[PDB]
């Protein structure tokens, strides 16, 4: 169309990462994984901390 060639020329002129298409989307998605997945994986081992230690020793 009327923006493919200009876009390619500008991208070649400015050899930068992030591919220019979704900067706001990248800035939105970047902190979300750290906020969510880290805070949901921490309980997985934090909660069984008191549960851990079952020696079940018999003699």
């Amino acid at each position: 169309a009327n923006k493919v060639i200009q876009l390619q020329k500008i991208f070649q002129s400015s050899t930068k990462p992030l591919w220019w298409r979704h900067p706001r989307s990248a800035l939105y998605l970047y902190p979300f994984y750290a906020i969510f997945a880290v805070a949901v994986v921490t309980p997985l081992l934090y909660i069984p901390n008191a549960i851990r230690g079952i020696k079940a020793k018999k003699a």
Binding site: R52, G53, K55, A56, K57
Partner: protein
Amino acid sequence: VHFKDGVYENIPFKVKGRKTPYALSHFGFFAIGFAVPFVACYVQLKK
């Protein structure tokens, strides 16, 4: 990517630095390898 001579750059180690004289790294690798059997035995029973 073409800025590496190709001598020690192929390994995530570093001779330069007094932080680890290639001993702490190997000690840590031994520790992480022995961790899984030792902790697996320890969590439910004695070593």
